[PDB]
Amino acid sequence: YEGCGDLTIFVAVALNKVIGHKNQIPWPHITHDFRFLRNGTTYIPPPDIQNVVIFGRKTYELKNRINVILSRTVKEVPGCLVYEDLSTAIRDLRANVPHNKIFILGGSFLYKEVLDNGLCDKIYLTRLNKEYPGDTYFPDIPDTFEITAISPTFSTDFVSYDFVIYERKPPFDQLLMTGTDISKPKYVACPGVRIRNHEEFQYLDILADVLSHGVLKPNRTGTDAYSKFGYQMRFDLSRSFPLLTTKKVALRSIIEELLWFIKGSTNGNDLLAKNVRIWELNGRRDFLDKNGFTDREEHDLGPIYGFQWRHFGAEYLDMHADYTGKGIDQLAEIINRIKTNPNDRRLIVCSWNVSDLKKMALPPCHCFFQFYVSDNKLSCMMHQRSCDLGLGVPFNIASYSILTAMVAQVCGLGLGEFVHNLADAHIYVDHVDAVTTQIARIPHPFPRLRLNPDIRNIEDFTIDDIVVEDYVSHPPI
Amino acid sequence: YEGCGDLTIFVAVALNKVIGHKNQIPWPHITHDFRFLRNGTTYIPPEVLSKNPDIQNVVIFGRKTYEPLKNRINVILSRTVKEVPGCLVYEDLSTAIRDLRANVPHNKIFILGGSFLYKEVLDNGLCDKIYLTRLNKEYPGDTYFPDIPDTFEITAISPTFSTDFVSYDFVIYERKPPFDQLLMTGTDISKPKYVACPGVRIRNHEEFQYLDILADVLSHGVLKPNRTGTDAYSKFGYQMRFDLSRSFPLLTTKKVALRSIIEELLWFIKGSTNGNDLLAKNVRIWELNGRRDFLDKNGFTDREEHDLGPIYGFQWRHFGAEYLDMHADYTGKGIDQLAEIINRIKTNPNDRRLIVCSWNVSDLKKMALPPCHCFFQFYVSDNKLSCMMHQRSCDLGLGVPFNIASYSILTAMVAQVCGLGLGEFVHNLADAHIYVDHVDAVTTQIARIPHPFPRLRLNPDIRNIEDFTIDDIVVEDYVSHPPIPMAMS
Ligand SMILES: [Cl-]
Ligand SMILES: [Cl-]
């Protein structure tokens, strides 16, 4: 295979490695993916030259490109060049047919032959987060390749997906003009990935930033933490559901917790009854008496989140009390105001009720969020005063992404962005090794969120009405 | 001068253009400036370094310039000394360069001064690049750097730095994308309508954060109505940060009324809700919103003129108190958040709950305006105080520059009283907008090249935050472009 190196693959691959079913594409058409494949395969560095596109006899369909077929069962096709061998086809085109670049568009045998003889330098692979029935498969990529580029996660009504590139294996004034010493972070997330458009990299980079540059200082828990202050992350909720994929995150507890905030409950038995334990330790006899709540029942958590959302300013008594018509129903008012005046700049739910702090088991961590409406899409921004990057923050991202999607449905709006402000972002010293493993993992396409579309009031959502589809993740750490 | 082009200048220059005084540096030494000059004049590209291991840069001066500059070929121009301890000497510049390039293997030639040498280099177009340390203070002197020809523009700006006695930055003046990066966005493969200072390619001045946001909102913001009747271009979610140990971020691209910012802050701190307290000091920030017509239109029909309700100050000092009117005595009532958080910082700086919140949901309806700067959080690490503030509604043209300054002063005040050094101010913008009638103003502003930021000096004797007065809060070395008129809508 002399002179047949540097061939580029384009392919779309399901989660179970299927690329074809009965000579057809095993999934419903992804228009986006064909826009992508076209754009990549027609690009000419900046007169009438074209790129070459090669496929096997099976691949049953291309404009503005040279088409080359590999068959031993046909030598004539309308419009196409035909060859019996890959060896023969590459040598011939590169000597006698003037072109820019050669792409390989498929048949498993074409891909296996291209891969087995080390003839491919680059693979543009559309990753689909779903298994599809099939009979034709993309061969395993040899350990000789790594992913160097990742796009944002996208989605259709039936799958989430992205594009990757696999490949084989700074001017002085930019340093001088910082004003600081001219002469490398101890930790870098996925150093091999050079084009880093997956939203999850926002999170990996922050982990890496805190471990590299955070100050080791103490805190209320006893265990110390590396800490740094001030970050902002954004997630496009029209596109994907930002549930982290570099480790497995379970959401059942997060969703029950959100629903419980929405019901305005301060009763921790409501969660335990569903075997949700997030809040258990903070409702126990020990923790309560230690924090001065001698006179309160176990699992009475005080006027925390849910109380503030539905009853801000009401006098708290106990978790059994009736607070209907008491205090200000922030959540209800703000949903109403979104429907009635989407341009309002005060679409805020504040849990940081300063008067009620002394009565709370834990003062709120996600203290404050604000909605925004622009072109019929709902955005949300949330302030998080204390941010556990090891264990906490990933649940918080999902929670407020789900809430925003919930509020958008009931208000008849599309989805914009969740913007998450982190104040004291920290990694506890015990988690340094878990995190080091995490930032080394290449992220999968994010999942999608599907809400029951019949639900028209925020109070009517239940756990079955909130489904995350197509969640592929690395193992739990 | 055949073959005598691309000479590179390094120079340090006062606001009045003085580079020398009695053969001495006019200002107290800036060691940072020497390290900068050193690093710039001794740098060899690794390409060249590997193919010539011992190669050095050349550095030229006239006899006058009185310190050999290690790791460089020191060249010295004179007509009155034929040899110097370990240097090359020449009658004139012309021959120096010709000889150096013909017969003395070197990497790059730098011109380190004498006015006449700078003058000769500029006049004859021999220089392609100037590395200039800008000082925001005039100093007495007798040697000046020549005016820089209109043929040069600034292409790089460092962060603003400061010493005990001046603020300064570094700039570069100069004469005059891979396909996978585009494909892998997943979106269109093929320019924003507005770009701030497009000639500046290295953009480390912090003010660029604010200038880039102005351009972003103009380029991509959505025009939307609001409660003022004047519409605005609007976009959601930004974050800016300012290093308050290096400089005070008073915007330089327009003249900002510092005095009005300070009086307003002191007014918040005292917990006052009487707009007359500001008017009595000819500060008019709040006048429109305490007016009869505006109070009545928003239902505050039995309220006294310029009684603004339980806004900011009241919330900082008396959160949860019952508001009666602006004359009522509230001492002891409500929760004194400012006092308590100040106390928490001293007692336990690693507390993760150092929050002052003005967004009192129970009091929103009694307010003239619900607060725009809702909520701020303090943070300590390495004995440095940082602050993060959430602004729900951000008037980019008029309000935001005041906010940045206001909270930077506050963080400095709180730092001083807690015995802390200075960290960062971190500004979170939610609804960031440009009103339609500020569009020309801002387009003017974003083309202007930032000056180095000023410095903040607090009276060190003040130990309680309530004892600060305007004389105690000084901003030094403020250089700015002219003011830009903008209507309050
Ligand atoms: Cl407003
Ligand atoms: Cl905490």
PDB file of N, CA and C in Angstrom, chain A residues 348 350-354 364-369 383-385 423, chain B residues 312 316 337 353-360 371-378 387-392 407 425-428:
ATOM      1  N   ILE A 348     -37.332  37.124  39.386  1.00  0.00           N
ATOM      2  CA  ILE A 348     -36.400  36.586  40.348  1.00  0.00           C
ATOM      3  C   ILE A 348     -37.105  35.768  41.437  1.00  0.00           C
ATOM      4  N   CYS A 350     -35.882  34.448  45.049  1.00  0.00           N
ATOM      5  CA  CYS A 350     -34.845  34.559  46.048  1.00  0.00           C
ATOM      6  C   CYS A 350     -35.165  33.689  47.251  1.00  0.00           C
ATOM      7  N   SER A 351     -34.257  32.766  47.559  1.00  0.00           N
ATOM      8  CA  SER A 351     -34.361  31.913  48.744  1.00  0.00           C
ATOM      9  C   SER A 351     -33.580  32.498  49.914  1.00  0.00           C
ATOM     10  N   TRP A 352     -32.737  33.494  49.656  1.00  0.00           N
ATOM     11  CA  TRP A 352     -31.921  34.094  50.707  1.00  0.00           C
ATOM     12  C   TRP A 352     -32.738  35.100  51.508  1.00  0.00           C
ATOM     13  N   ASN A 353     -33.691  34.564  52.269  1.00  0.00           N
ATOM     14  CA  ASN A 353     -34.514  35.350  53.152  1.00  0.00           C
ATOM     15  C   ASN A 353     -33.710  35.611  54.409  1.00  0.00           C
ATOM     16  N   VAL A 354     -33.191  36.836  54.520  1.00  0.00           N
ATOM     17  CA  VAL A 354     -32.214  37.178  55.547  1.00  0.00           C
ATOM     18  C   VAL A 354     -32.795  37.008  56.946  1.00  0.00           C
ATOM     19  N   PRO A 364     -29.406  28.559  52.285  1.00  0.00           N
ATOM     20  CA  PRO A 364     -29.420  28.100  50.899  1.00  0.00           C
ATOM     21  C   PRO A 364     -28.084  28.266  50.170  1.00  0.00           C
ATOM     22  N   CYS A 365     -27.810  27.334  49.276  1.00  0.00           N
ATOM     23  CA  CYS A 365     -26.592  27.310  48.493  1.00  0.00           C
ATOM     24  C   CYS A 365     -26.866  27.883  47.108  1.00  0.00           C
ATOM     25  N   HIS A 366     -27.935  27.417  46.480  1.00  0.00           N
ATOM     26  CA  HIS A 366     -28.421  28.057  45.272  1.00  0.00           C
ATOM     27  C   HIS A 366     -29.427  29.100  45.749  1.00  0.00           C
ATOM     28  N   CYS A 367     -28.931  30.320  45.982  1.00  0.00           N
ATOM     29  CA  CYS A 367     -29.622  31.339  46.785  1.00  0.00           C
ATOM     30  C   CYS A 367     -30.669  32.107  46.031  1.00  0.00           C
ATOM     31  N   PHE A 368     -30.501  32.153  44.723  1.00  0.00           N
ATOM     32  CA  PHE A 368     -31.041  33.237  43.940  1.00  0.00           C
ATOM     33  C   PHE A 368     -31.033  32.804  42.475  1.00  0.00           C
ATOM     34  N   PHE A 369     -32.187  32.815  41.814  1.00  0.00           N
ATOM     35  CA  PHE A 369     -32.188  32.700  40.357  1.00  0.00           C
ATOM     36  C   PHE A 369     -33.110  33.699  39.702  1.00  0.00           C
ATOM     37  N   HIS A 383     -27.345  31.936  41.025  1.00  0.00           N
ATOM     38  CA  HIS A 383     -26.196  32.205  41.887  1.00  0.00           C
ATOM     39  C   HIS A 383     -26.008  31.117  42.958  1.00  0.00           C
ATOM     40  N   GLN A 384     -24.829  30.485  42.952  1.00  0.00           N
ATOM     41  CA  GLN A 384     -24.495  29.441  43.902  1.00  0.00           C
ATOM     42  C   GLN A 384     -23.336  29.858  44.790  1.00  0.00           C
ATOM     43  N   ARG A 385     -23.641  30.123  46.060  1.00  0.00           N
ATOM     44  CA  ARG A 385     -22.664  30.756  46.952  1.00  0.00           C
ATOM     45  C   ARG A 385     -21.525  29.829  47.322  1.00  0.00           C
ATOM     46  N   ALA A 423     -19.565  30.923  43.070  1.00  0.00           N
ATOM     47  CA  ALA A 423     -18.808  31.816  43.919  1.00  0.00           C
ATOM     48  C   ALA A 423     -17.621  31.028  44.457  1.00  0.00           C
TER      49      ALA A 423
ATOM     50  N   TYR B 312     -31.680  50.049  48.783  1.00  0.00           N
ATOM     51  CA  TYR B 312     -30.337  49.616  49.179  1.00  0.00           C
ATOM     52  C   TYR B 312     -29.911  49.852  50.641  1.00  0.00           C
ATOM     53  N   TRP B 316     -29.283  47.215  53.642  1.00  0.00           N
ATOM     54  CA  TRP B 316     -27.945  46.897  54.163  1.00  0.00           C
ATOM     55  C   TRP B 316     -27.871  47.023  55.694  1.00  0.00           C
ATOM     56  N   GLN B 337     -26.914  43.799  58.143  1.00  0.00           N
ATOM     57  CA  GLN B 337     -26.117  42.940  57.287  1.00  0.00           C
ATOM     58  C   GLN B 337     -24.701  43.440  57.074  1.00  0.00           C
ATOM     59  N   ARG B 353     -20.713  32.247  53.492  1.00  0.00           N
ATOM     60  CA  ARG B 353     -22.047  32.826  53.657  1.00  0.00           C
ATOM     61  C   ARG B 353     -21.932  34.332  53.957  1.00  0.00           C
ATOM     62  N   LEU B 354     -20.924  34.951  53.363  1.00  0.00           N
ATOM     63  CA  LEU B 354     -20.678  36.363  53.535  1.00  0.00           C
ATOM     64  C   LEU B 354     -21.477  37.135  52.482  1.00  0.00           C
ATOM     65  N   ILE B 355     -22.787  37.204  52.700  1.00  0.00           N
ATOM     66  CA  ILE B 355     -23.733  37.759  51.749  1.00  0.00           C
ATOM     67  C   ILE B 355     -24.510  38.932  52.354  1.00  0.00           C
ATOM     68  N   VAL B 356     -24.574  40.019  51.584  1.00  0.00           N
ATOM     69  CA  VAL B 356     -25.491  41.123  51.819  1.00  0.00           C
ATOM     70  C   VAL B 356     -26.506  41.083  50.671  1.00  0.00           C
ATOM     71  N   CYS B 357     -27.793  41.010  51.003  1.00  0.00           N
ATOM     72  CA  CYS B 357     -28.844  40.846  49.995  1.00  0.00           C
ATOM     73  C   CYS B 357     -29.823  41.983  50.129  1.00  0.00           C
ATOM     74  N   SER B 358     -29.958  42.786  49.082  1.00  0.00           N
ATOM     75  CA  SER B 358     -30.905  43.904  49.086  1.00  0.00           C
ATOM     76  C   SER B 358     -32.248  43.503  48.509  1.00  0.00           C
ATOM     77  N   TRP B 359     -32.352  42.265  48.027  1.00  0.00           N
ATOM     78  CA  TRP B 359     -33.565  41.810  47.367  1.00  0.00           C
ATOM     79  C   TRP B 359     -34.524  41.287  48.411  1.00  0.00           C
ATOM     80  N   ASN B 360     -35.106  42.212  49.159  1.00  0.00           N
ATOM     81  CA  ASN B 360     -36.051  41.865  50.207  1.00  0.00           C
ATOM     82  C   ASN B 360     -37.415  41.762  49.570  1.00  0.00           C
ATOM     83  N   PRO B 371     -34.032  46.879  43.734  1.00  0.00           N
ATOM     84  CA  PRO B 371     -32.630  47.112  43.482  1.00  0.00           C
ATOM     85  C   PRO B 371     -32.111  46.398  42.234  1.00  0.00           C
ATOM     86  N   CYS B 372     -31.136  47.027  41.584  1.00  0.00           N
ATOM     87  CA  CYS B 372     -30.491  46.509  40.383  1.00  0.00           C
ATOM     88  C   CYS B 372     -29.271  45.678  40.778  1.00  0.00           C
ATOM     89  N   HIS B 373     -28.449  46.212  41.681  1.00  0.00           N
ATOM     90  CA  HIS B 373     -27.399  45.409  42.294  1.00  0.00           C
ATOM     91  C   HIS B 373     -27.964  44.688  43.516  1.00  0.00           C
ATOM     92  N   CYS B 374     -28.414  43.455  43.307  1.00  0.00           N
ATOM     93  CA  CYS B 374     -29.301  42.742  44.241  1.00  0.00           C
ATOM     94  C   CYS B 374     -28.664  42.174  45.490  1.00  0.00           C
ATOM     95  N   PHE B 375     -27.404  41.817  45.373  1.00  0.00           N
ATOM     96  CA  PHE B 375     -26.871  40.702  46.098  1.00  0.00           C
ATOM     97  C   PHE B 375     -25.380  40.731  45.844  1.00  0.00           C
ATOM     98  N   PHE B 376     -24.564  40.797  46.888  1.00  0.00           N
ATOM     99  CA  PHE B 376     -23.127  40.583  46.714  1.00  0.00           C
ATOM    100  C   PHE B 376     -22.585  39.621  47.747  1.00  0.00           C
ATOM    101  N   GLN B 377     -21.490  38.950  47.382  1.00  0.00           N
ATOM    102  CA  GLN B 377     -20.874  37.931  48.213  1.00  0.00           C
ATOM    103  C   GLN B 377     -19.393  38.199  48.315  1.00  0.00           C
ATOM    104  N   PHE B 378     -18.866  38.156  49.540  1.00  0.00           N
ATOM    105  CA  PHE B 378     -17.445  38.347  49.781  1.00  0.00           C
ATOM    106  C   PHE B 378     -16.748  37.001  49.945  1.00  0.00           C
ATOM    107  N   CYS B 387     -14.972  40.098  45.995  1.00  0.00           N
ATOM    108  CA  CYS B 387     -16.390  40.374  46.058  1.00  0.00           C
ATOM    109  C   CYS B 387     -17.018  40.003  44.724  1.00  0.00           C
ATOM    110  N   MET B 388     -18.198  39.396  44.781  1.00  0.00           N
ATOM    111  CA  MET B 388     -18.967  39.085  43.577  1.00  0.00           C
ATOM    112  C   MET B 388     -20.343  39.649  43.781  1.00  0.00           C
ATOM    113  N   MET B 389     -20.829  40.390  42.774  1.00  0.00           N
ATOM    114  CA  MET B 389     -22.121  41.063  42.812  1.00  0.00           C
ATOM    115  C   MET B 389     -22.979  40.641  41.630  1.00  0.00           C
ATOM    116  N   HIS B 390     -24.270  40.466  41.899  1.00  0.00           N
ATOM    117  CA  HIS B 390     -25.243  40.088  40.889  1.00  0.00           C
ATOM    118  C   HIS B 390     -26.089  41.309  40.547  1.00  0.00           C
ATOM    119  N   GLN B 391     -26.023  41.746  39.292  1.00  0.00           N
ATOM    120  CA  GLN B 391     -26.850  42.851  38.798  1.00  0.00           C
ATOM    121  C   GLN B 391     -27.937  42.330  37.857  1.00  0.00           C
ATOM    122  N   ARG B 392     -29.206  42.447  38.253  1.00  0.00           N
ATOM    123  CA  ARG B 392     -30.335  41.920  37.471  1.00  0.00           C
ATOM    124  C   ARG B 392     -30.598  42.692  36.190  1.00  0.00           C
ATOM    125  N   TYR B 407     -18.626  49.201  43.698  1.00  0.00           N
ATOM    126  CA  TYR B 407     -18.327  47.960  44.392  1.00  0.00           C
ATOM    127  C   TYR B 407     -16.836  47.734  44.561  1.00  0.00           C
ATOM    128  N   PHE B 425     -12.803  42.165  42.163  1.00  0.00           N
ATOM    129  CA  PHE B 425     -14.237  42.409  42.077  1.00  0.00           C
ATOM    130  C   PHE B 425     -14.759  41.633  40.881  1.00  0.00           C
ATOM    131  N   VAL B 426     -15.812  40.848  41.100  1.00  0.00           N
ATOM    132  CA  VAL B 426     -16.382  40.007  40.054  1.00  0.00           C
ATOM    133  C   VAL B 426     -17.819  40.429  39.811  1.00  0.00           C
ATOM    134  N   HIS B 427     -18.082  40.873  38.589  1.00  0.00           N
ATOM    135  CA  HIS B 427     -19.356  41.480  38.250  1.00  0.00           C
ATOM    136  C   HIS B 427     -20.188  40.542  37.371  1.00  0.00           C
ATOM    137  N   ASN B 428     -21.311  40.060  37.890  1.00  0.00           N
ATOM    138  CA  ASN B 428     -22.192  39.199  37.101  1.00  0.00           C
ATOM    139  C   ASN B 428     -23.328  40.025  36.531  1.00  0.00           C
TER     140      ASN B 428
END
